[model samples]
Structure formats: structure tokens, C-alpha cells
Target: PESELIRQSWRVVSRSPLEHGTVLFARLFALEPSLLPLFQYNGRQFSSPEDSLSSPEFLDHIRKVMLVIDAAVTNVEDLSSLEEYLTSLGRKHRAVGVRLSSFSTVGESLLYMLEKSLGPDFTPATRTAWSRLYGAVVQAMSRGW
Candidate 1:
């Protein structure tokens, strides 16, 4: 059961690097490529961040965020930091006309991508966990940027 829980967590979380990153970059670019133009400024790798998203420092920052996400999932200690990050993003999003309404779409797209990528192994529990996590992330990120 221990390993199963870990397996389940991994099944949910593992797909996030690709699914979350892709959906985020894709949706944002489609809506307003200029909002976070650094992400889309480069050619070829616009859909998902690789070793570079815009510059070395930016990529490193993205990588740090991904790590923060990973940590936030299993540990609530980082929840505040995560929230602070999200609040900042939300403020920026607001400045760019990113509707507060889009959070649901973003969350749904995130889950959809996970299911598509992970297949049946993504159980109800996994979905619930992801949902809760997403809610927290969004709430935190929505804070003043």
C-alpha cells in the first residue's frame, strides 16, 4: 500500500511536468503571447520549456517553480510560498487581462492533460488530490503580484 500510494502520486505528478507546462505555455501563448513574452520569444520550444524558456536565468526560475510544485504536493509547509508565487502570477495575469475565470479552465486543462497522459492509473483519489492541489496553487498565486 505504501508503494501503491507512491505509485499513485507519481502517476499523477510525473505527468505534470509535461502536461502542466504544455497546457500553461500553450494557453497563455494563444491568449496573449505578449503577457509573458519571454516564454514564447524563442522558436521551436515555445510549447514546453526545455533547458531554456527565454534565458538561462528564466529557465532556472521555471525549473525552481516546478520543483516547488513537486514539494508542495506532499508537504503543506511550502503551501504559503506556493500561494505567494501564485498570487504574484495572478496579479500579473490581471494586469494582462487574464480573466479570473480562466483559473477553472486552466485547472480543467491540467487534469485533462494528466488523464490523457497517465491513462487509467490516474484514479479518483489522484484526481481529488490534484484538484485540491490546484485549488491551493491558484488561490496562492492569485495574491497581489
Candidate 2:
């Protein structure tokens, strides 16, 4: 079911991770403009969306997100394996003053990114699989909040 569906779906996007992550981040900022500010840790606020594309740090962060998602997919059958890691991530974000609300926005952007990336192959079943995974990930992270 979800485990295999998740694996099969990744066969498409996993090959070109950075590109998919670009779509994810692009959709992410479009989904929530406020998140644009969160990417700037250098004290130089990026005034435009395109400007964020130039930041290696932001791009690295995007790659990290993709890696984390991939990790979840790899461990789709047992999310509990990531509990400690996700909890620490959650605590890190909280310490950074990140708003928990952004996670939902990120989740929506994730779905939107996959929809755009997978196009017609992004079936409802696939969507549910990803959604459930994200839900579990969020819960694990929220434990530290």
C-alpha cells in the first residue's frame, strides 16, 4: 500500500533531487511569502523571490529538506526510526523562533510541488500516501514543541 506506493513515486523525482527541491522551495515561497524571510540568516533580507535562488545556504537548506523527505520514504514502513532526529529538528526550529504554522504551509507546498512534478501520475492514492507520511513527520517533530 503506502510503503510501495511511496517507493514507486520516488522513482520519478528521486533521480533529480535538487530540481524537485527547487520546485518545492519555489512553490513554498509562493504559498507563504512570510517564509521568504526565514531563509535569510545573513542579515541581508532578500527583497525578491528570485534573490533567494542565489543563496547557497537557502539552496542547501532545500536540499536538506529533500534528503529528509527521502529519508522518510526510505523508512516509510517505520517512521518511529526517525523520532529522535525529528524531535531534535523540531526543537532546533523552535529555538530558532520558527513558527509551527509554517509546517502546514510547507506540507501544502509539498503536495503542490508533487502535483506539479508528477502531473497526471500524482494519483489520489499517491497523494494520500505522502500526506500521511508528512502527518507522521510533523507529529514526531511536534513532540519537542
Candidate 3:
């Protein structure tokens, strides 16, 4: 259990440029290049992966987002609060064209990345916990718009 917690902690740190924030978008793009188009930014609209992943401001936003998640998970007993919090995320995700289906794609890549980075120590319990976490994330983003 200690090892798993340590692994999770390190992985979180790896995902952040600053220890205080997380960088899920960068991690996603690094792991799944095919999804880069998801961040495109056209003249009338921006849609380039670089638009979101390559900017300091956006990176800061992602880091703050991750920090919130880290703080929230500190008390899973408040699942209703989690749901309410995630519902806002779900709405924001919709505004950015992120669908519930996108969650699976992102999640699968995340799991694979974890395995690659963690080697043989990811463990079933860790995977399940991560999956549950992602599920909550997806539930909030499934649809609101």
C-alpha cells in the first residue's frame, strides 16, 4: 500500500510542472498524439492542441485544475460534493468539445502511461482507484449542453 501511494504521488508530481498543479492535457497529448487536434484554435475558434497545451496560461489553468482534484480526493466521503464539483467540470468540458466518450480514450491512455512509467508496481488496487477517479470525472462531463 505504501509503495502504491508513493507511486501515485510520484506520478502526480510527474504530471505537474509545479508541485502545486497538475498537467493532464500535456500528459494526454504526450501519450496520445492523435488527440492533439482536440485543442485546435481556428480564427473564428481555436482548436489546436498547442493552443491549450503549449501556453503558459493554459498550463497554469491545468495545474490549478489538478490541484483542485488533489484537494477534493482528500475526502472521498463527500461524494455528493464531488458530484457537484464534477458537474461544473462536465459543463466546462462540454464547452471545450470534450464528450463522455473522450473520457475513455483519455483514461485508457492514462492507464497505459501509468503502467509504462510505474513498471510492475501499478497494482490492481491502484488501477481500480484511478478508474473510479476517472469515472467521477467523466460522470461530470458526460453531458450538460
Computed on alpha carbons, the lDDT of every model, listed in order, comes to: 0.58, 0.87, 0.59
Full-model lDDT, candidate 2: 0.87
lDDT of 1 by residue, 1-145 (tens): 3334434555455555644555544554455444353443335334433334445655555455556556665555346655656677678767765666667766775676566656787788777767777787877766753
Off by over 4 Å in 2: none
Error of 3 at 127 (Å): 0.7
TM-scores for candidates 1 onward, in order? 0.57, 0.95, 0.65
> What's the lDDT for residue 55 in model 3?
61
Candidate 2, residues 1-145, lDDT tens digits: the string is 8889889988788888888989888888887787787666668888878898888988888889889999999999998898899999999898877888889988998888888888898999999999999999999888878
Q: Give the TM-score of candidate 3.
A: 0.65
Instruction: For model 2, state the Cα shift of residue 92 in Å.
Output: 0.8
Q: Please list all clashing residue pairs in model 1, or write none if there are none.
A: 83-140, 86-141, 86-142, 87-140, 87-141, 87-142, 87-143
Give the Å error, residue 117, model 3. Answer: 4.7
Task: Give, for candidate 1, the lowest lDDT window spanning 10 residues.
Answer: 44-53
Our model 2 lands, by Cα RMSD against the true structure, at 1.0
Name the 10 consecutive residues with the lowest summed lDDT in model 3. Answer: 37-46
